[PDB]
Each structure stands twice: as C-alpha cells, then as structure tokens.
Amino acid sequence: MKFPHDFLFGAASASYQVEGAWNEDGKGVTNWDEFSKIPGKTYNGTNGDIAVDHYHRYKEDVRLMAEMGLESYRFSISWARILPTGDGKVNEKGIEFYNNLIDECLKYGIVPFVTLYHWDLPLPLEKDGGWTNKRTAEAFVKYAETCFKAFGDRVKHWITFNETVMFCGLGYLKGAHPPGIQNDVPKYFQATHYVFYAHAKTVAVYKQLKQYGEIGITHVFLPAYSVDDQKENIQAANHANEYETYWYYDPILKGEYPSYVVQQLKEKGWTPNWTVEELEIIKQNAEENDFIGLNYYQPIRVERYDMNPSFDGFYRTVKMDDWEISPEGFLEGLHMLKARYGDIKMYVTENGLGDEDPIIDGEIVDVPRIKFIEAHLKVMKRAIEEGINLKGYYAWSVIDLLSWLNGYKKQYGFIFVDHNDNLKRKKKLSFHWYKRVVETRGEELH
Numbered sequence: 001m002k003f004p005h006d007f008l009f010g011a012a013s014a015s016y017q018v019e020g021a022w023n024e025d026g027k028g029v030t031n032w033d034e035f036s037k038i039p040g041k042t043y044n045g046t047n048g049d050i051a052v053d054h055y056h057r058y059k060e061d062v063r064l065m066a067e068m069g070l071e072s073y074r075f076s077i078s079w080a081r082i083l084p085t086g087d088g089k090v091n092e093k094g095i096e097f098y099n100n101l102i103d104e105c106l107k108y109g110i111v112p113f114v115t116l117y118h119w120d121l122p123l124p125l126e127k128d129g130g131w132t133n134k135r136t137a138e139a140f141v142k143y144a145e146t147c148f149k150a151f152g153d154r155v156k157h158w159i160t161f162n163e164t165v166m167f168c169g170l171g172y173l174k175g176a177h178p179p180g181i182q183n184d185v186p187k188y189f190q191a192t193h194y195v196f197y198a199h200a201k202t203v204a205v206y207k208q209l210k211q212y213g214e215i216g217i218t219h220v221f222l223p224a225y226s227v228d229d230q231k232e233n234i235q236a237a238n239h240a241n242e243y244e245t246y247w248y249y250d251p252i253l254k255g256e257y258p259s260y261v262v263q264q265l266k267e268k269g270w271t272p273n274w275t276v277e278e279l280e281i282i283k284q285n286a287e288e289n290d291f292i293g294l295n296y297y298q299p300i301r302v303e304r305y306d307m308n309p310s311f312d313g314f315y316r317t318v319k320m321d322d323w324e325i326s327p328e329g330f331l332e333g334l335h336m337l338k339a340r341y342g343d344i345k346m347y348v349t350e351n352g353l354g355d356e357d358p359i360i361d362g363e364i365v366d367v368p369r370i371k372f373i374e375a376h377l378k379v380m381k382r383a384i385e386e387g388i389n390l391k392g393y394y395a396w397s398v399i400d401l402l403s404w405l406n407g408y409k410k411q412y413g414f415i416f417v418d419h420n421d422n423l424k425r426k427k428k429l430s431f432h433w434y435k436r437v438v439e440t441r442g443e444e445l446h
C-alpha cells in the first residue's frame with residue numbers, strides 16, 4: 001500500500017470544459033462564451049454551450065468516480081454561476097448546483113478540491129480589461145469569500161487560480177485566449193501581478209474565515225533544461241526558469257518577485273503598475289499558502305537565440321532526443337523546487353495524456369494514457385522516497401471534455417463520452433486500471 005493515506009489519488013475537470021448549461025439557471029455570459037463564437041478561434045467552431053453536459057448528468061458522473069474508487073475530485077466553480085456579472089447580486093441557483101455536486105462527492109466519501117478560477121471570467125470583467133484591471137482582482141476576492149462562506153463547511157481544499165501562465169500568456173502574448181491580444185508584454189506582466197495580488201489577498205481572507213481547510217495556487221510547472229553543456233545554452237535555461245518558474249512561484253511562496261526578471265522589466269519599460277500596499281499583501285501572505293499545485297506535462301529543452309521562440313526572443317525550445325515525455329525531467333524538476341521553496345507541500349494537480357484514443361469493438365483501450373500516468377506515478381514514488389512532499393495526484397481529466405481550442409478531438413481522461421449516442425458515458429481501459437492503482441495504493445513494483 002506504498003503511497004500514504006494522507007496522499008490523495010484523484011482526477012480533475014474544469015467548468016466550461018465539462019458543464020454546458022451555458023445559459024441556464026441564471027449563469028452570466030463569460031469571456032469564453034463570446035470568444036468561442038468568433039469564427040476561426042476554435043476547432044470546428046466547437047461550443048461550450050453543451051460541452052459534455054456535466055451540469056445535468058453530475059449525479060451519474062460522480063457515481064462513476066465512486067465506482068473508480070476516486071479519492072478526490074478536483075473541479076472548478078463557474079464564477080458566472082455564483083456571481084453572474086462578477087460582483088453584485090449572488091445567484092442562489094449557482095450555489096444550489098455546487099452544493100449538490102459537493103454533497104454528492106461527499107455521499108461517496110470523495111473529497112472536493114475546488115478550483116475557484118479556471119479561465120472562465122464573467123464578461124463584464126473581461127470588458128473592464130480583465131486581469132489588467134485591479135478591479136477584477138478585487139471582484140475575485142469578493143467571489144472567493146462568497147464560495148468560502150457557502151461551501152467551506154464541507155470543502156476544505158481550495159485552489160484559487162489554475163495556470164496563470166496560460167490565461168495571461170495566451171490572452172496577451174499569443175492572443176489565442178481571450179481577449180485575443182498579441183505581443184502586449186506589459187499587459188501580460190500586469191495580468192500576472194493583479195492575479196498574484198488577488199491570490200494572496202484571497203488567502204488572507206480565507207485564513208480569517210477560520211474554516212481550517214487548505215488553500216494554494218496551481219501553476220504550470222514547466223522545468224527548463226539546457227539542450228547541452230554549452231554555457232550560452234545553460235544561460236538560456238536559467239533565463240527560461242527565471243521567467244517561467246521563479247516569476248510565478250516566487251511571489252506566492254517567497255513573497256518577493258525575483259530580482260533578475262524585475263531588473264529586466266524595469267530596464268525594458270515593462271514593469272507592472274504595482275503599489276506598495278499590493279506588494280505587501282503578497283509579502284505578508286506568502287507564508288499562508290498551505291501547498292502549491294503543479295500542472296506538469298513536459299519539460300522544455302532550450303537553446304539560445306543564435307544557437308519555437310520565447311516571447312522575448314532570447315531562447316527557443318527544440319525537439320530532439322538527448323509532447324515531450326521525460327520522467328527524469330519531472331523528477332529533477334521537483335528537486336529544483338525543493339531547493340528553492342523548501343519542504344513545500346505539493347499536489348500534482350494535472351498530469352495525463354491527450355490522445356486520439358484507440359477504439360476496438362466499441363471499447364476504448366487507451367494504453368498510452370495508462371503508460372503516461374504509470375511513468376509519472378512511478379517517479380512520484382521515487383520523489384517521495386527522495387524526500388519530496390507530494391500529497392496528491394490528479395490525472396488531467398476524469399471524463400472526456402471540450403478542449404478550449406481543439407474542440408472534441410484529443411480525448412483526455414478516464415470516462416469516454418460518446419458524441420454519436422447522446423453523450424453517453426463509458427468506462428475506458430484507464431478507468432479500470434486506475435481503480436486498481438488506487439486500491440493497490442500504487443504498488444506497481446517499487
């Protein structure tokens with residue numbers, strides 16, 4: 001029974017990706033409801049209108065989780081369900097729905113771990129400039145407090161933000177996510193700052209509520225490596241790590257932003273409009289985080305600009321062989337995080353494989369996914385023996401869901417959803433395997 005009992009095995013979803021019922025029970029419009037209906041933005045013009053219909057089928061879905069012997073379900077609350085316009089009047093039917101989702105998980109002894117913001121911002125607040133406006137950060141702490149008050153007698157594991165890197169990076173640098181802005185780097189760093197503000201402030205609010213759960217943020221964890229032993233390439237990697245780890249992980253865990261990158265934003269005219277009050281709140285609540293969430297998929301191997309580019313030129317990523325796999329990459333990454341942040345408590349809050357799942361006689365035999373998960377689970381076992389403080393694993397995607405960009409195409413998850421048969425669910429091969437892995441508590445030889 002090798003993983004300890006205070007380690008949770010789980011699976012994850014996000015609201016807009018699974019829920020559907022986009023205009024039901026008083027849900028406000030959100031940024032993604034609008035953005036996905038701009039032609040050419042999303043694969044086949046796919047819609048979060050219905051998604052996988054999880055709103056209406058939640059009792060069913062949680063049953064399947066129960067039958068999986070899932071210990072924890074990580075899901076996201078839709079802000080537009082609780083507070084439709086972002087602030088103002090609370091919507092009692094949003095609270096009714098999430099109370100039911102929570103109570104159902106709980107019937108079966110499944111631990112809700114709630115993500116407050118997984119990219120689905122109510123529209124008014126997007127048009128305010130979203131994360132580039134302090135307003136949106138202040139609206140979020142008010143929203144968070146509403147969820148704590150409503151759900152925190154039962155919910156005792158809370159995530160504020162999923163993957164700030166992406167919703168700021170994709171919306172202001174690459175323009176792939178709303179609001180669709182391209183190479184506006186000062187807005188990007190602004191966005192990240194007001195988010196880190198909203199977080200640390202929300203954490204303060206939570207501790208004041210005396211609910212005695214745990215709270216933390218969940219970042220992309222994209223550990224970066226020099227393509228070889230060359231100094232100029234190792235320099236590129238340090239740079240990579242400064243911008244892609246330290247900028248994200250330092251403000252929340254350490255309470256200070258990292259001076260390397262701060263120096264460079266000043267020297268470029270890219271420093272966000274930040275104030276002492278804000279930076280102090282961030283400073284004062286860094287020690288108040290109970291854990292860090294990691295969304296790990298791959299490392300990145302890098303070489304320098306002269307030697308896929310990074311938003312400041314300087315380095316590029318390169319595919320080669322010493323999308324990427326690398327259990328070795330993930331593990332060294334973990335130690336890299338322990339050296340800097342200490343014995344911080346870690347939840348691998350996403351990890352899994354997107355695929356065109358192989359189908360045989362109507363069965364889904366997703367052995368790539370099993371092999372992906374097994375490999376990472378294996379090195380987490382090593383990591384724990386090597387001292388890392390990992391206390392949970394959340395395979396990205398409990399149930400097939402709507403990709404933001406790629407519609408339905410690259411399945412994620414354990415429960416298959418049948419688009420040809422009224423979105424009927426079916427256990428995949430990974431479902432049966434993971435159930436066994438939970439019951440064995442990860443005894444797959446170590």
